[PDB]
């Protein structure tokens, strides 16, 4: 079984009764990068050997996905991207959608035709010709009522190529437009066809993992940071799925239903801060939380001020006086208050107890508008294209 993080090692070492998740994800990878993340999700098992997420990976050719390890070959489905499925700019384009539908129908459905998931978690790299093509397709499919469940999109944002940047901005804008119509039509308390979009930023993630784990001078120079980022983003998502179902508190208990609400109704951009706390003092607490939010794996200059829901939990040792202390409680609240004043929006924050000696603070903000990464990314795009044409003598 996949033990992608120290947290996953700790919960499975100390609790062998982890047999359910809060929300039944149907995981679909679409790009190469999406297929990597999807392959990690497929690796997860319960305490009993059973697999957590029924998952698929998608591309055009067999050759793509040849190195996947947890997604079996049948679940490896193969057939610019949003030109193949269009009825006009392609003859027998419905042949592609029918194959998409049938494959989706067989993985995510009973023998008696029952959908075995609550929400589709769709992973794709934005910017890449394939990923941004795929993301544009997903959006259109939602508009056509293709999926029998809401979708959550997990998207990574590129850097370094002005053409990938252009592609990513086009998708983000299409996503923004969709969210705008949806937020107008649905109403605050209704489940949304697009449950959320969760953004990861390549240049942000590369900074974190390359500014660390090289404490001497040498960066090992062969470790693909992406693989490191995949581990971190996917484990965090699996973790927030498992914790509410498997851990409770003698104080404020965060339930699966709270998570479901948080993940399904806000309908817009969502982010997560994962902060481990080993030093039990106020300053280290405040600092790790702020780091997790502003310089973590899910950071993208998010518009926290615009959040409509929050949630989270501190997974803390039983009988640690620091996490029974009202000064600590007030410090978490006050730190989160700097992103979005919590008085103004729905949500709660639990303190589930686990059987280990450190704490992990998970902070979630949902229903935000466009990550300001859109702006810095448009700025870099221009700089890059400028220097591309510049010096060209």
113: left (phi over 0), alpha (psi -120 to 50) or beta: left
How was it solved?
A: X-ray
- Give the burial class of 287: count Cβ atoms within 10 A of its Cβ; 0-12 exposed, 13-18 middle, 19 or more buried: middle
Q: For tokens 């850097």, what's the residue?
A: 159
Burial class for 341, CB neighbours closer than 10 Å (0-12, 13-18, 19+)? exposed
Question: Which residue, among 381, 337, 325, has the nearest Cα to 363 in the 3D structure?
Answer: 337
Residue 292's domain comprises 2-393
Closest CA to 163 of 382, 393, 392, 387: 382
> Under 8 Å CB-to-CB from 284, ≥6 apart: which residues?
277
**Judging by beta carbons within 10 Å of its beta carbon (0-12, 13-18, 19+), is residue 186 exposed, middle or buried?**
middle
Calculate the dihedral angle through the C-alpha atoms of 31, 36, 40, 42, rounding to the nearest 10 degrees: 50
Is the C-alpha dihedral spanning 101, 107, 111, 114 positive or negative?
Answer: negative
Residues flagged as binding site for Mg(2+): 64
Please state, in angstroms and rounded to a whole number, the distance separating the CA atoms of residues 43 and 137. 26
Q: How many domains does the chain have?
A: 1
Instruction: With CA atoms as reference, report the closest residue to 118 among 259, 252, 16.
Output: 259
Residues annotated as binding site?
Answer: 32-33, 64, 129-131, 202, 226, 230
Q: Are 353 and 250 in contact (CB under 8 A)?
A: yes
Token code pair at residue 175: 């996503």
Minimal CA–CA distance to 310: which of 333, 279, 281, 276? 333
3-state SS, one letter per residue, for the chain? CCCCCHHHHHHHHHCCCCCCCCCCEEEEECCHHHHHHHHHHCCCECCCCCECCCEEEECCCCCCCCCCCCCCHHHEECCCHHHHCCCCCCCCHHHHHHHHHHHHHHHCECCCCCECCCEEEEEEECCCHHHHHHHHHHHHHHHCCCCCCCEEEEEEECCCCHHHHHHHHHHHHHHHHHHHHHHHHHCCCCCCCEEEEEEEEHHHHHHHHHCCCCCCCCCCCCCCHHHHHHHHHHHHHHHHHHHHHHCCCCCCCCCHHHHHHHHHCCCCEEEEEEEEECCCCHHHHHHHHHHHHHCCCCCCCCCHHHCCEEEEEEEEECCCHHHHCHHHHHHHHHHHHCCCCHHHCEEEEECCEECCCCEEEEEEEEEECCCCHHHHHHHHHHHHHHHHHCCCC
Q: In angstroms, rounded to a whole number, what is the distance separating the alpha carbons of residues 381 and 272?
A: 26
- The dihedral sign for the CA sequence 235, 241, 243, 246: negative
Alpha-carbon span 41 to 51, nearest angstrom: 9
The alpha carbon torsion through 377, 135, 175, 307 (nearest 10 deg) reads -80
Whole-angstrom Cα Rg for the chain:
21
Q: C-alpha distances in angstroms, 199 versus 100, 204, 259, 330, 374?
A: 25, 11, 18, 29, 11
CA 217 to chain centre: 32
Residue 86 structure tokens = 């269009």
Domain with 296 in it: what CATH number?
3.40.50.1440
Rounded Cα–Cα distance for residues 253 and 244 (Å): 8
Chain-centroid distance, C-alpha 306? 19
The whole-angstrom separation of Cα 222 and Cα 58 is 27
Phi, psi of 299 (to 5 degrees): -75, 140
Binding residues for GTP: 32-33, 129-131, 202, 226, 230
Q: Which of 142, 153, 139, 118 is nearest to 38 (CA)?
A: 153
Exposed / middle / buried, residue 4 (Cβ in 10 Å: 0-12, 13-18, 19+): buried
């Amino acid at each position: 079984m996949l033990l992608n993080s120290n947290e996953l090692e700790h919960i499975h070492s100390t609790n062998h009764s982890v047999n359910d998740i809060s929300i039944r994800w149907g995981v679909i990878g679409a790009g190469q990068k999406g297929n990597k993340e999807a392959d990690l999700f497929a690796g997860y098992k319960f305490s009993n050997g059973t697999t957590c997420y029924p998952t698929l990976a998608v591309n055009f050719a067999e050759s793509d996905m040849m190195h996947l390890q947890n997604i079996i070959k049948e679940d490896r489905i193969h057939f610019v991207v949003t030109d193949l499925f269009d009825p006009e700019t392609n003859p027998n384009a419905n042949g592609y959608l029918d194959k998409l539908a049938q494959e989706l129908g067989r993985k995510f459905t009973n023998e008696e035709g029952e959908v075995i998931v609550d929400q589709f978690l769709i992973c794709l790299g934005a910017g890449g010709g394939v990923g941004t093509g795929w993301g544009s397709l997903v959006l259109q499919l939602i508009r056509e009522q293709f999926f029998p469940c809401p979708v959550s999109m997990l998207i990574s944002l590129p850097s370094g190529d002005p053409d990938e940047i252009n592609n990513a901005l086009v998708l983000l804008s299409e996503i923004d437009e969709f969210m705008r119509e949806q937020d107008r039509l649905f109403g605050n308390s209704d489940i949304k066809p697009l449950a959320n979009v969760i953004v990861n930023d390549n240049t942000q993630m590369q900074r974190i993992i390359e500014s660390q784990k090289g404490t001497k001078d040498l960066k090992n120079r062969y470790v693909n940071w992406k693989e490191v980022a995949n581990d971190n983003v996917v484990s965090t998502l699996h973790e927030i799925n498992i914790i509410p179902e498997n851990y409770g508190s003698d104080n404020v208990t965060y339930d699966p239903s709270d998570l479901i609400k948080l993940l399904s109704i806000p309908g817009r951009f969502l982010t997560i801060g994962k902060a481990r706390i080993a030093k039990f003092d106020l300053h280290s607490l405040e600092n790790s939380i702020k780091r997790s939010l502003d310089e973590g794996f899910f950071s993208a200059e998010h518009q926290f001020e615009t959040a409509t829901m929050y949630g989270g939990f501190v997974l803390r040792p039983s009988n640690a006086d620091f996490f029974k202390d009202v000064n600590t409680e007030n410090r978490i609240r006050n730190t989160l208050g700097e992103y979005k004043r919590l008085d103004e929006i729905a949500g709660k924050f639990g303190d589930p107890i686990w059987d280990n000696e450190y704490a992990v603070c998970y902070t979630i903000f949902a229903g935000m508008t466009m990550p300001k990464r859109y702006i810095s990314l448009a700025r870099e795009g221009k700089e890059l294209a400028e220097k591309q044409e510049q010096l060209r003598a």
